[PDB]
Design a protein around this nucleic acid. Sequence first.
RNA 1: AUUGUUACAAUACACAUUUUUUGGGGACGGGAAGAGGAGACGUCGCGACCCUCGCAGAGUCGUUCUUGACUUGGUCGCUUGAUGUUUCUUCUUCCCGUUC
Lengths: 94, 69, 75, 82, 72, 84, 100, 80, 79, 164
Amino acid sequence: RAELEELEEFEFKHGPMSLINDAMVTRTPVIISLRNNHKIIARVKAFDRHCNMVLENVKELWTEKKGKNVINRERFISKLFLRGDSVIVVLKTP
Amino acid sequence: VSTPELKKYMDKKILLNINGSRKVAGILRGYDIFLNVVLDDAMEINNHQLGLQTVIRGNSIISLEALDA
Amino acid sequence: MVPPINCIFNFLQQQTPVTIWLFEQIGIRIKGKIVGFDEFMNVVIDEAVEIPVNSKGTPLGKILLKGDNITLITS
Amino acid sequence: NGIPVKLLNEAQGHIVSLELTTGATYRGKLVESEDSMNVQLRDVIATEPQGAVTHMDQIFVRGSQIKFIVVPDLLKNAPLFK
Amino acid sequence: PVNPKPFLKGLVNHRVGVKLKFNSTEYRGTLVSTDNYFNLQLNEAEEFVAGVSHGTLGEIFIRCNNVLYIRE
Amino acid sequence: NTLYVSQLNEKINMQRLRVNLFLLFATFGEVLKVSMNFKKQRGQAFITMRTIDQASLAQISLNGERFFGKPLKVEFSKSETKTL
Amino acid sequence: MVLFNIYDDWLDRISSYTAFSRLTLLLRALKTNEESAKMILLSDPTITIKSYHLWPSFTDEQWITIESQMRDLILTEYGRKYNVNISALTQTEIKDIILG
Amino acid sequence: IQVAHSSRLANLIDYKLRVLTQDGRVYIGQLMAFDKHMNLVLNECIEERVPKIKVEKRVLGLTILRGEQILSTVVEDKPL
Amino acid sequence: MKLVNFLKKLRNEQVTIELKNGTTVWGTLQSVSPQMNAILTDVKLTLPSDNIASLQYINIRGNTIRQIILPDSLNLDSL
Amino acid sequence: MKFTPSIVIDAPQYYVDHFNGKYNVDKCVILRDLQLETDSESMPSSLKHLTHILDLTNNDLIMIPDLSRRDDIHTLLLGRNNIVEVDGRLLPMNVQNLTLSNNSIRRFEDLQRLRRAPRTLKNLTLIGNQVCHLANYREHVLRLVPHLETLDFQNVTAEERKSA
RNA sequence: AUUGUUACAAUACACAUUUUUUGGGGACGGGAAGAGGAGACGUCGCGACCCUCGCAGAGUCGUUCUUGACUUGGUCGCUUGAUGUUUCUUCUUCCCGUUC
């Protein structure tokens, strides 16, 4: 009961989410992508098992125009709680 | 857990309707709880053959009208 | 009758030819031979080749395809 | 257990319509039911959004892709709830 | 004989090539590790958007649901 | 309470007919019945009201009233309605 | 005993006194309201904190802007607190900044 | 539109709710039953369509809706 | 253990949400559950920039919720 | 008494008219025999709650008053009233099913508000009045109010239209 | 002059295919006329020379002043009615409403 769930806590630091964990520990920026042609930038704070993260300094970048002329919109958000399904790829910049 | 009633449709040709416009067809050999239909025939669509046997996945399998009622 | 669990085993035993189908792209279809056995739908496919079928030779090694992505398999 | 499932089970041998993800409207009898909504039909008409209608003899539907399964006005109050 | 998980394990500390369905971008880099849910962790990542590279990422991570296949 | 109509235009549609009936009967009192139960058409419609007085009034006033060409034959129902 | 250069990359660009002043401004702001200060610091996530720095490495103009923001925060918070009518001059606000 | 401060789905049973699909086809019906996946039994489903300007209407079934494609339910008006 | 725990702890906060459609909706969470089943008290809406077409009472499924915007900026999940 | 907000509030908005839509309001203690002598004032108290079916029959309403959006009062019943003239720009698209039976519409020129109906009134019926007895009245109606589908229970045919 | 037993739900686990974690004076509107939108597939309506002719979700029975069990609008016009797939390629004049 306890040991089954408790053993899975250390699995984050060993596997694929190790990097994420590290980032969370030592606050640094990370480019988070999305399904509908979106690109978010933020520094992590908390973390979870199924990639249900929460970050600060949320700089969003997404298009809302036709194929002929692009338009890079911007908006400064913070303290969001994004779902793990939409999160495609993350990376800790130096 | 609860097994679907595929015993009634066993040993009979069925015109399948897969996801994303694909009218496949073949006789049902085996079945399971996850809906991975082990069929023993395949023919795309006009008509043209492409391999005899074909074990399809459970997700991509919406419609399946039986030829012989 | 032939079940999905034993099917995998059979495939492993034999190492026969296969033509995998994709979900998103209709034209681009994989071609190779299955190898690995597992509980989920995901299994190793040796000597992969993504051919562009009609409504032609993609470069790739031993493709370990995903469980959800696979649309078809012949054996 | 699920109430909807129970209701479905109860309605066995009745004219139940359907609606898929793509939008293929059906209308026929109910063969059987289960925990997972695996519906089977008999004398099932096909009036799809594509236009080209048809009249199918039999058809088995997947529960995941189904949007909503229709049901008659008889089984409203009793004898499913209490 | 050679299973999928085993293969994956073998491939750790070696070059890997993953491609996603939605927005097809070939991610090229050295594989670090993997879990039971089939999550990816790459090093020296190069997001090849249909051949042409966007930019050299470095260290990176990838979800299980997006990816299609894994190759050399 | 209920008032069984007869001798009306069958050529008109069902829902429309019902609507018309509702419109007609709102002057006398509150019409309880929303839709027709028989589904046969050609006059046979049971206008269910809240009050009996209202129903009576309707019977009195709309006896042989011009509705879609023909004169409607108003009359009191034999059995009581399922809703009432 | 741990060692930290609190002037993470300021001494080469600006003088020592200036650096000290900046630190004071930051620290005071943090004290007043920490979350706000943090937000101010990390407005642009591209301006990242280094592996051996306590603060984000801004350009000179950027730094100035940040300082200004901090000052504003300090003022605003003060106003909220003590219901003062208005700051008379910049030299009156110096006292507020330094001493408290 | 009348709507009190409801706590949960159990308290708001037997009420006329508008349901939104994944594709964006608006519905409307009385919520009869509840479930684990939120398969709400509609008393009489009046479906509506909007082309990819103006909303259409229909009246096919009194269906038991599925939980996968459902976006969010919204109360229209109380009964009785 | 889970990130949903944190969500559950919060209540009566005017939190926005970037849904699958794209329209914002800033309202009270009310009774948040295990499967992210939020219940809006009062929020904005833009039916398919964002136009003005809001509704008062509402109830949302957790599958649709792609994000939960901030109301009270505070980090305290464990307890 | 006069149609106030309090009266509206009091009114029974529980039993919905199940033929179409919801909330069949009946203003005051009962709209049927409310005796609203003046025009329908304080319409804002309802605030477009709901076809709506605001059954304001058996009243003494001099003129038909509306104040709401395009979907607020489709099946309005104003039977047995003293409706002299019903000109207005508020209820443009909504009021389709107009039950104006036993009204006091005397002349054909009194229906000029409803007439020029291409933009003035998107839909309107009107029947069972003094103007119905006048010579060539139906024809006139057809000419002016083309949107009037059902003219006193009988439909406006193509032949009729041609004639007018 | 409450305690005991039994049954069913809620709370306590919950990333792999049937489900909550991945298949994205000038503008505007309507109607009519003139000059250089159209064809299929269905799905509901306005008229009728037509059909059809009546009182009851329907029928049967047990028991008692109202309840338990067992069975299973069709056709033709539209003489310019509405509406979703699916292929191809506007200007002038008058009348009526809204806005400045």
